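Homework-ish question, so no full write-ups if that breaks the rules, but can someone show me the predicted structure for this set?
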Amino acid sequence: SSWSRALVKISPYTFSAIGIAVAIGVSVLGAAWGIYITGSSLIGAAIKAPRITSKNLISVIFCEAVAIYGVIVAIILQTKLESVPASQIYAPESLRAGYAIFASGIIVGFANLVCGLCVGIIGSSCALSDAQNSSLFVKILVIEIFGSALGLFGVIVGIIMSAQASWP
Amino acid sequence: AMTFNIHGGYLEAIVRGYRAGLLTIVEKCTLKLVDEYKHMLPLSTFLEYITYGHMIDNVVLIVTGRDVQELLEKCHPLGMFDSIMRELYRLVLVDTPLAPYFSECITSEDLDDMNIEIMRNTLYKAYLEDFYKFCQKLGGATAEIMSDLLAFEADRRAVNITINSIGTELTRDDRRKLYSLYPYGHEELAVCEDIDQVRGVMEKYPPYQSIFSKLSYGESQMLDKAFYEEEVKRLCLAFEQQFHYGVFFAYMRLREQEIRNLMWISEC
Amino acid sequence: FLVTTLVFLVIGIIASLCTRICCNRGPSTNLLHLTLVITATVSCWMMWAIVYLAQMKPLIVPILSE
Amino acid sequence: TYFRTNKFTSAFQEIVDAYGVAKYREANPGVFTIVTFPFLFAVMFGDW
Amino acid sequence: GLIYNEFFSVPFEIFSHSAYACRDLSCSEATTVGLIKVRDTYPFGVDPVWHGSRSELPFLNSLKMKMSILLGVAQMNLGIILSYFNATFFRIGVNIWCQFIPQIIFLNSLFGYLSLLIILKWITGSQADLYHVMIYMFLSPTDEL
Amino acid sequence: TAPFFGFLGAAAALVFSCMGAAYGTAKSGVGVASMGVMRPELVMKSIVPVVMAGVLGIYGLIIAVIISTGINPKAKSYYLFDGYAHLSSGLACGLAGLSAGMAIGIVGDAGVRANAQQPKLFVGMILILIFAEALALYGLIVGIILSSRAGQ
Amino acid sequence: ETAPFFGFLGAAAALVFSCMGAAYGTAKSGVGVASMGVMRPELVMKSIVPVVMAGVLGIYGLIIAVIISTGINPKAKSYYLFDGYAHLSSGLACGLAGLSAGMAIGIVGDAGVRANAQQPKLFVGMILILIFAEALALYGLIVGIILSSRAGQSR
Amino acid sequence: ETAPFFGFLGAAAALVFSCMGAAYGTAKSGVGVASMGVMRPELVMKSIVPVVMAGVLGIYGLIIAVIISTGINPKAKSYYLFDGYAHLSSGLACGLAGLSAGMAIGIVGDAGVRANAQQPKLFVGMILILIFAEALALYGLIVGIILSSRAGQSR
Amino acid sequence: ETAPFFGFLGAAAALVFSCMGAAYGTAKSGVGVASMGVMRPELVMKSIVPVVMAGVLGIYGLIIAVIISTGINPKAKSYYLFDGYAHLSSGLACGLAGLSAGMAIGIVGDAGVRANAQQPKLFVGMILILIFAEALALYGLIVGIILSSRAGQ
Amino acid sequence: ETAPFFGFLGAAAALVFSCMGAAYGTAKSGVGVASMGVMRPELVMKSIVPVVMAGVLGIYGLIIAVIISTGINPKAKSYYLFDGYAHLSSGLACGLAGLSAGMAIGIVGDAGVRANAQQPKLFVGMILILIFAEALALYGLIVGIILSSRAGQSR
Amino acid sequence: ETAPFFGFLGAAAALVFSCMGAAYGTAKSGVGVASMGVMRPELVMKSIVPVVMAGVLGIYGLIIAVIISTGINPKAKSYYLFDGYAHLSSGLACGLAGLSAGMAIGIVGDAGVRANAQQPKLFVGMILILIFAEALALYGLIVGIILSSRAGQSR
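A: Not a homework solution, just the prediction itself:
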């Protein structure tokens, strides 16, 4: 009861800000991990032969697209912020807006992380495959592009959830 | 899964590229492969075990003397590294995985390592110790390949023992006591004194079934060639080399097989 | 109940007569057959006795679901 | 030794003998179990 | 299955018409003090009403447990009795009287109290015992009470 | 007040679904590259299993969309039952998608190797993978049914 | 009251655990089937039975989830805490049983498929093992159905 | 009020843990049988004993769960916390015993299936060991029955 | 009021832990027995001594559980917390002792199977070790009974 | 008030820890003696000393626990939380000391079995090590007895 | 107040930790000494010095426990929360110091057994490490005694 009351009495603005920051942080972390995964294979292939640098750069660009989408989502969330008035600090509208912001941020961050990991693994495999044979680069690039859609879907879901903000 | 990208990715890519590029000429190719392997310097332990594989044979050869100075001519860095006669054996007991065990198992020195047959027995014991050490480093799909190689060596030794080395005290008990499913079911080969008996013993493993076939070739050779030739023939399985896995040993084995094929080519 | 108890016993006697008529070809064979018939009759009668003693005077009455 | 097996009793005798054998004329639990096993396996699946 | 009065997961017409009849309850619910009054016991099988009733589980469970206990007692008694016949047929030593008699007597007596209690509860209708208080009586190792 | 759980359900449904979708797509993709090293033609057709794994993300995305649309606070009073139901509906869809994708990734990775070895068994691998992928569809059905219980 | 917050959670958990078990079974079954069919493509069709046997657990879990969902209706009757608790218990039991059965079926099927080409008797042995495993899933489904039905009274 | 939650949770836990133990035992036995039967057809049927020996534990657990579920009857008696605590304890004991028996039976059955290719004189010993292990399931069922019987006598 | 919620839990935990220890011992015992019987079928029957002795722990656990269940008699006396807590502690102690004894017996039997297979002359030593191990289980059962006997406040 | 909870918990913890330590020591001793039972059965008979020492340590722990339990007589004198806390601490200390001594003695015996098998002249050293190890258990028992005696000084 | 709820617990924990550390050190030293005696029975008697030196931890722990137990006496004077907290802190410090000293002495003795077996010249010299460990244990005991001396400082 008293513990439950204290839990229900937590400030929603703090949770909303935490989710907003966490979305960008997780997107950046996932993009960096995918970039490193792709870069290891790209550097190995270049050491083997520098002929496929242009083909390899596509994986890096795709990985950075996740970071770009995360940054856009973070900017949108920052735009979604309000003044947080003292009177409505515990109003139902404020609590709903904070919960929606936190949920959208968590969803965006998790989707960005998953998409970044998948893209990094796909690019790491694809660079080695291209080093084995340049004829298979087209199919590998198509597969990577198809797998990159996870981040776009997560961003779409986060944008849809962002409309729920109604902080007075 | 992410550990491969965390570390070892560049080395794995370089090894894959070198293997894909692969296909006194034999000596030159062996020297080039050894240089490529050395220039590559977690995976450090795997490389050490892979080198120790041939280093066991190199140390066994160096254990002679008896024209011992000729061992410098075959100082291939791939297997004949300097870092890898009981007084000298104790000194050589360091920097090798199988050496500490062979110090006690082969404490008789030349008495248990006579160049006629007992030297081969000591080499087989060292190979068994090295195979056990390699199998200890479990965690990857290479455990199956290592087990297959050890089984092939043990079965070839057992076949050689039953063929003619039985008169050299390589009896049924010696088929596993000195001659290096095999780690659990090698007892079936203790009574395979005939080629038909060898085929019947191989029938206990359906994958090993029909591998012996007429046994005119492969099984015809003594020492470790009988079932090792079966592994050489089936090495097309090793040619798969699925990605994101330890393939350094596979690349080394492929390079060794290519060198052996080039040597067997010789003057056409 | 007790009337049915004799009914099971009487059923075995007719079965006993049939078994004797059939297995009279073998005396030791007939002896084995009689054991099987007696065992079957006893088992069936015991099962029926359990089923009847359970519901003879129930301690708990049956309530029906809706 | 083995007790003589009839045409119908052979299957039950073989099923029971999977635990072992006895002396030339020792105890043969197959005689009772030829009907006991049907007399007990019926209960676990009683549904007419 | 004929004994169990269940045919293809469904009851049917027993040799009698209806073992238990709802005591009054022309419109009253089954769950009542009157409950169901039994005119007579159905001899062919279990009461048809009991199978589909809410109280099907407890009564059937108690009956099945009692039947299993009795059948196990009978099978153990037959197996123990076969020992004397085997000893006589093979002309075994005095070990039968030395060991087979106590072996067949100890377990028989130990299960005899439970079997006799089950029979008496079934026979005398001692509802003050039911499935549970029988074990309760068997539970106490000490005297008195 | 309770609507925090309901909002969290939609986010969890997409997050957990994509978590399994990426894992399935990664394992399927890795095998495809391995087959593409030698078998040029087989790899192009084998991409279907990767495409099948990517579909699970779409199924989770649609489920998330429905949950978001049903959390309109100003439209109807979102009582605790609606929030509890939406969170429960999302939890099943997200968890099922994660498991369904994981099996597809494990099956698909072996399937690429199997097809590269013997092309005849390609039909068999597709049949097993298609049967496994039905679990995600099964999770989608449960999600719709649970979400439909938001009447009161 | 707060009873739906537990009842719906249990209903969702049933389907979640059933799907997890089905996926765990299907992964091993597919791996074994691929390993067997690499060398003997003829027996690939016969080796697919354990896959469907494992997948049947998903259908069982879906049926249990549908029953649990239909069992809650505030517009019909006041779902007291007892009803929600019993529904959650039934869901959890069914889901855990399904997950365990799926894992066991997957392990057994993978082993049998690996041993399928060694001897044709595996075609019967693995089928028998899969049936014996699915018996546990059927028993769990029956127990869950019984618990869900008993959840309807709530005094 | 909250006691029926505890009772239903105990019954569900009993069923789930018994199912998990039976599944583990069945998976171990299936792996052993798949390994053994490749060489000889004897393991196809002559060694399928543990396959049903492990499912016997699951059947016992299902029976105990059904008994526990039938134990609760709010319309007949307003259960206090005593009934819920007793039901939960009985369910936990039954489930834990079932899991332990399942694990032990699975290990023993895998060992016996492996040894099947050895001298067949060990079949009697393996069966005896399996029966001795399965005695734990009967002991757990007896303990659960005693607890359920003592459960309803709350004041 | 909350005493039964502890006493019944203690009894169930005692039974569960005793069963777990018995199973843990019996797994190793059966593995060793199967190995010895494969190696030497002659002594397979006589090697089931640890396997048979494993069930003694389960029997003792069942007895302790029955005693604990008989301890809870609300009609006989209002169960205060002083009795329920004592019963729960006695059950926990008995279960832990049973689990420890089962693990020890499993290790001892696993060693002794190979020891007898190499040479049956160590059967006496194996039996003595098993008896010494089971002494711990006996002491635990006695302690549990003594603790349960103090339910009179 | 709630002191009997603390006292019973302390006694149970003492018994459990002592049993666990004795079990670990006995298992280590048996593992060590397994080799001596074949290498030199003549010396194997004298090799049972560490098992006896472990049993003695377990007996001492059980005796301390029994004394602690016998010290709780609520009807004779009300048990304040001070006495319960003191008894629980005494039991915990005795159990921990017994477990540590048992583990140490087990390791020592496991080493000493091979040590004596290699050379019979190491029996004196093994006996000295075992006595030194048992001294720790004796000290722990003495400390537990002192604490149990002091537990009744409250008012 | 609730002073013995912490003071007596700390007094027990001091002896518990000291016994655990002494047991670990003695076990390591005994394993080393057994190996050395197997190598050479002549050095077995002379190499028991580290084993005996490791026993000082038990004596120090017993003395600290006795002092702490004597320091609690409500009949003589009521002890506040501070009076028990200080004793608990002293006991914890003494126990942790004893455990650390025991571990260090065990490692040092395990090394020194082989060191003496190889080179008898360094055998006597190696005792410096054991002397340093004993000095560390004595310093810890002195610190604990100083902390415990403040029992009567409260008011």
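Now go work out the reasoning yourself. Hint: DSSP finds four helices and two strands in chain E.
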